[PDB]
Design a protein around this ligand. Structure first.
Ligand SMILES: *[C@@H](O)[C@H](C[C@@H]1CCNC1=O)NC(=O)[C@H](CC1CCCCC1)NS(=O)(=O)CCCCCCCC
Length: 174
């Protein structure tokens, strides 16, 4: 494999997209994917969830141990610029599509009206990454950006946007 099955099992369907289990109690995702006007998430009422949203990055910390099968991993404050990361794309249809990305700079961006604390990067999957097979598409938001700090995997962002060209992607960062 590229990424272990345990890392993929952290990628969970959520709203119009996906999120990522950092630990048994920390779930991260992309803000525009998150349900609104709900009294609960994953069965838990809001009073049992520390909810924090800042410019397309959303963190939940549950009081209940939600995924105790998991150990905690590091959430970095952004990806290391210039390094190659992996976007762990799951699809509706069951495919696992880990897309390699070389990460650009962390910058602030207004995007379709919303203020994004984001980080661009360039896919390494083809000359263009237009379309379904080599790039990110609607429904993919929330997928984690990961890389290995030595012998351990870390996560540094959640997927938020891509150009129509397809080569440039943006993740939301802390
Ligand atoms: C996930 O919801 C979706 C994923 C995109 C769609 C097309 N290919 C993808 O990977 N994201 C969007 O549709 C995104 C949503 C906005 C909502 C407000 C906050 C920012 C994201 N819109 S978009 O189509 O990706 C807009 C183009 C992005 C340009 C990026 C410029 C980089 C410098």
């Amino acid at each position: 494999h590229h990424a272990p099955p345990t890392l993929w099992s952290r990628v969970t369907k959520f709203g119009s997209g996906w999120g990522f289990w950092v630990s048994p109690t920390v779930f991260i995702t992309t803000t525009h994917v998150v349900p609104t006007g709900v009294k609960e998430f994953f069965g838990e009422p809001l009073s049992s969830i520390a909810i924090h949203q800042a410019g397309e990055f959303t963190q939940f910390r549950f009081s209940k141990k939600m995924r105790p099968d998991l150990t905690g991993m590091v959430l970095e404050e952004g990806c290391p610029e210039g390094t190659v990361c992996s976007v762990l794309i799951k699809r509706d249809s069951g495919e696992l599509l880990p897309l390699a990305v070389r990460m650009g700079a962390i910058a602030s961006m207004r995007i379709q009206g919303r203020l994004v604390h984001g980080q661009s990067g360039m896919l390494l999957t083809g000359a263009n990454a237009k379309g379904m097979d080599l790039g990110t598409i609607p429904g993919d938001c929330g997928a984690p950006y990961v890389h290995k700090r030595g012998n351990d995997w870390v996560v540094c962002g959640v997927h938020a946007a891509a150009t129509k060209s397809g080569n440039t992607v943006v993740c939301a960062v802390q």
